[PDB]
Design a protein around this ligand. Structure first.
Ligand SMILES: *[C@@H]1O[C@H](CO)[C@@H](O)[C@H](O)[C@H]1NC(C)=O
Ligand SMILES: *[C@@H]1O[C@H](CO)[C@@H](O)[C@H](O)[C@H]1NC(C)=O
Ligand SMILES: *[C@@H]1O[C@H](CO)[C@@H](O)[C@H](O)[C@H]1NC(C)=O
Ligand SMILES: *[C@@H]1O[C@H](CO)[C@@H](O)[C@H](O)[C@H]1NC(C)=O
Ligand SMILES: *[C@@H]1O[C@H](CO)[C@@H](O)[C@H](O)[C@H]1NC(C)=O
Ligand SMILES: *[C@@H]1O[C@H](CO)[C@@H](O)[C@H](O)[C@H]1NC(C)=O
Lengths: 187, 14, 182, 187, 182, 14
C-alpha cells in the first residue's frame, strides 16, 4: 500500500528555569528532517537535500517572526503556563513490598518494593536490613512512565531470610515531607 | 487569563 | 540535547491518502492535550488540566492546514517517495500492583509506530473488549517514529487472561502481547 | 567474653566546593555517642548521659582550638589536598556485553552491559536497538563501590532477538572524551 | 547530613583488653590511608597516592593515645559496661566480569562488624588459600558499626569454587558466603 | 609541600 507523511516538530528547551532557552523546529518528510531552526544557530538551515532551497526561502520569509517565537511561545508558556501547572504537579507515591516466590525456606529470595503513581520522576528508594543500608543485592527497573502523568518503579532485593529479620523499604520523593517506610518480616 | 501558544508551522514555497 | 525541561508546542503531523492529521502539545514528555480536528476543540489528557489556562484550538487547525500544504509540496519534490512502514513493538504492564478484586489499569505501550496510523485493541480470554479503554494521541519519538498507550481499566481475576492486539501495515499478521497475573 | 570499645570520629562536610563547610566530631563509647561538636551549633554538647559534664569541660578547655580546626583541618585539607588528588581522580570504565543464558532461540533473554572500574561515580549508561533508545526492558543494579576507589554497575536488557538486529550499550562518563559504545549481534 | 563531599579526618578507634587501636582518614567514603602503629608510618590504600602530599604519622599516634585515655575514663564512668557483639554480614562479588583464564579479584563485603575485631579468610574448593589476598582497615558505619573488604586476586576456572570465611564473636559458628562462576 | 591535617582528638578530664 502507498502512503506519504510529513511532520512538524516545535521544541522548546529550558535549563535552570528560563535563564537559558533554546528553540528547535524541524520539518520532516516521512522520517527525514530536511529543514531546521535552532536558537543557538540563528537561522533556518537545510539538513538534507529536500531542504536545500527550503532554507533560503524560510529566512527571507519567516526568520524575523521565528526568532521571536522563542519568547511569545517558549519563554511565555513556561513562565506563564508551566509554573502554575506542569511544574507544580506533585503526585505522592505508593509503596508496597512483595515476595519473589511463595514463602522462604531460608533460600535466595527477592523482595520487590513497588513505588507507583508518583510525579515528578525525581525519586530515591533504598532497602534496609534492620536499620542497615542494604548496599548490594538491590537493583531497580529503568523507571517507568505511565503516560497518564505518573511514573512507577520496582526495586528488588536479593536476600536470604532468617528469623526476627526486618526489611524496610525507604522511599524519598519531593511530594513527601517525610519518607515513606514500608517494613516486611519473615513471620 | 494567559493562554498557551503554539509555535507557528511555516508553509513551504508554492 | 540537554535540558531541565522540554516542551513540544504545536507538534503537527499530517499524511495521505486519508487526509489524516494530528496536533498536540507535550511537556516534559507528557501529552498536555491534543486538538479534535472534528469537534474542533482542546482535548486534554487530564480533567484537572485546562481548568484555568486554556488553548485556542484554532491555532492547531492552522498548523494542520499549513502541514497539509507542506505535505503535498514535499511528496512531489521527493519524487512521490513513500514512507516505509515499521514494526510497532508493544509491551504490557500494570499501572499499580496486581491484587485480585482490586481495580487497576492494563497498559499497552506500543513503540516504533509509523506511519502514524495503527489500531490497538484489547482482549480478555481471546475475546475483544470495549470500555475501560483510553488511548493516547500518537506521540513523537526522537527518530521521528511514534508511540501510543492503550489503557484497560479492569479487575484481576484468578482465571482471566488478557492480550493487547496490535495491527499495522508494518505487520503481515497482527502482534499480540499476552499478559495475566501470576 | 568481656570487651570495651571507644571511638572518635572527625567529619568535614562540604557543599559547593568550600563555600560552605561544616565540622562534626563525635566521641563514642562502644556505640554510644555521648559528646559532640558541630560548627552549626558552635560548642561541644552532651548527646547522652555519659557526656553530661564532659561538655562543660571540652569548651572550657578546647572550644577555641576546636572552632579553629574548621580551617586548619577542614578547609585546609579540601583546598590544599583534595583538589589535587581525590577530586581529580579520573578512572575510565570498562564496558562489556554479556548474555543472560546461552544463545537465543528468539525467546525472552537479557543482555548485560557491564560498566566497571570507574571513578568518580557520575555515569550514564543506556541501551540501543539499532540506533533506537531502548526505553523499556532496561534495569540496573544500585551502583556498587568496590572499596579500592572504583565503582562498577550492570545494566541489563530484557529483549527478544531476531536476526540482523543490533544492540548497543552507550556509556558516558566524565573520564571520557567520547562515549564508549559496545555492540552485540545475534550472529 | 547533606553535602557534596565528606572527609573523615582522624577517625580513631581503640579497645581493650588487647590494646587494639586504629587511626584512618577517608574521603567521600574511601580509605585514603591508615596508620601502622608499629612500623609507625602512613600506609595508603593505593600506591599512586601519597606520592606527593604526605601525612605526618605521629599525628595519628596522638589520637590513639588520647583515645586510650578517653577509653579508660569512659569504661569506668559507664560502670564497666561491655559492648554488644553483632552479626557481621558478608556478601561476595567480582571486581570485573567473569571470564575464564582472565584475572579478576574476588570480593567479600562484610558489613555490620563490631566490635571491630573479626577474622575474614578465603577458601577455594573448601580449602583455605593465602596471597592474592588484601584487606581494608575496619571502616566506620553510620551506626558506629564496621565494614571491611577482602580481595582475592585469582583466575576463573570452569571447575573451581570459592567461599568467604567470616569469623566473629558475634557468630556462634562461622558464616560462609559461597560463590562460583555460572 | 602541603600535608594532610587530622582533627584533634581531645582528652577527657583526668
Ligand atoms: C541559574 O541561575 C542562577 C541564579 O542565581 C545563576 O547563578 C546561574 O548562572 C544559573 N545556573 C543554573 C543553576 O543552571
Ligand atoms: C527525481 O526524479 C527525476 C526524474 O525521475 C530525477 O531527475 C531527479 O534527480 C530526482 N530527484 C529526487 C529528489 O529524487
Ligand atoms: C483499524 O480499524 C479498522 C476497523 O476496526 C480495521 O479495519 C483495521 O484493520 C485497523 N487497523 C488496521 C490494520 O488498518
Ligand atoms: C557556589 O558559590 C557561588 C559563588 O561562586 C554561589 O553563587 C552559589 O550559591 C554556589 N553555586 C555553585 C557554583 O554551585
Ligand atoms: C554507676 O554505679 C554507681 C555506683 O553504684 C551509681 O551510683 C551510678 O548511678 C551508676 N551510674 C552509671 C554510670 O550507670
Ligand atoms: C581470628 O584469629 C584467631 C587467631 O588464630 C582465631 O583464634 C579466631 O578464631 C579468628 N577469628 C575469630 C573467631 O575471632
Amino acid at each position: 500500500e502507498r502512503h506519504f507523511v510529513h511532520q512538524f516538530k516545535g521544541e522548546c528547551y529550558f535549563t535552570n528555569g528560563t535563564q537559558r532557552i533554546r528553540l528547535v523546529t524541524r520539518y520532516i518528510y516521512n522520517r527525514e528532517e530536511y529543514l531546521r531552526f535552532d536558537s543557538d544557530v540563528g537561522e533556518y538551515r537545510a539538513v538534507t537535500e529536500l531542504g536545500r532551497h527550503s532554507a533560503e526561502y524560510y529566512n527571507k520569509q519567516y526568520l524575523e517572526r521565528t526568532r521571536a517565537e522563542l519568547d511569545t511561545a517558549c519563554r511565555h508558556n513556561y513562565e506563564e503556563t508551566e509554573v502554575p501547572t506542569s511544574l507544580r504537579r506533585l503526585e505522592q507515591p505508593n509503596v508496597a513490598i512483595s515476595l519473589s516466590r511463595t514463602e522462604a525456606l531460608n533460600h535466595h529470595n527477592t523482595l520487590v518494593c513497588s513505588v507507583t503513581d508518583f510525579y515528578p520522576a525525581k525519586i530515591k528508594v533504598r532497602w534496609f536490613r534492620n536499620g542497615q543500608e542494604e548496599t548490594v543485592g538491590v537493583s531497580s527497573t529503568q523507571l517507568i512512565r505511565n503516560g497518564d502523568w505518573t511514573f512507577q518503579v520496582l526495586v528488588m532485593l536479593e536476600m536470604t531470610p532468617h528469623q526476627g529479620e526486618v526489611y524496610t523499604c525507604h522511599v524519598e520523593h519531593p511530594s513527601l515531607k517525610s519518607p515513606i517506610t514500608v517494613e516486611w518480616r519473615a513471620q | 487569563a494567559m493562554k498557551r501558544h503554539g509555535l507557528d508551522n511555516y508553509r513551504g514555497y508554492s | 540535547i540537554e535540558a531541565d525541561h522540554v516542551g513540544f508546542y504545536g507538534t503537527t503531523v499530517y499524511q495521505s491518502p486519508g487526509d489524516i492529521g494530528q496536533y498536540t502539545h507535550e511537556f516534559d514528555g507528557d501529552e498536555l492535550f491534543y486538538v479534535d480536528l472534528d469537534k474542533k476543540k482542546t482535548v486534554w489528557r487530564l480533567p484537572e488540566f485546562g481548568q484555568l489556562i486554556l488553548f485556542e484550538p484554532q491555532g492547531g487547525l492552522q498548523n494542520i492546514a499549513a502541514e497539509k500544504h507542506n505535505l503535498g509540496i514535499l511528496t512531489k519534490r521527493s519524487n512521490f517517495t513513500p514512507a516505509t512502514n515499521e514494526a510497532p513493538q508493544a509491551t504490557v504492564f500494570p499501572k499499580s500492583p496486581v491484587l485480585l478484586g482490586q481495580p487497576n489499569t492494563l497498559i499497552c505501550f506500543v513503540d516504533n509506530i509509523f506511519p502514524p496510523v495503527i489500531n490497538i485493541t484489547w482482549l480478555r480470554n481471546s475475546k475483544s473488549v470495549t470500555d475501560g479503554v483510553y488511548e493516547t494521541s500518537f506521540l513523537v519519538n526522537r527518530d521521528h517514529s511514534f508511540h501510543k498507550l492503550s489503557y484497560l481499566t479492569f479487575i484481576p481475576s484468578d482465571d482471566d487472561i488478557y492480550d493487547c492486539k496490535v495491527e499495522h501495515w508494518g505487520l503481515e499478521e497482527p502482534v499480540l502481547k499476552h499478559w495475566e497475573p501470576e
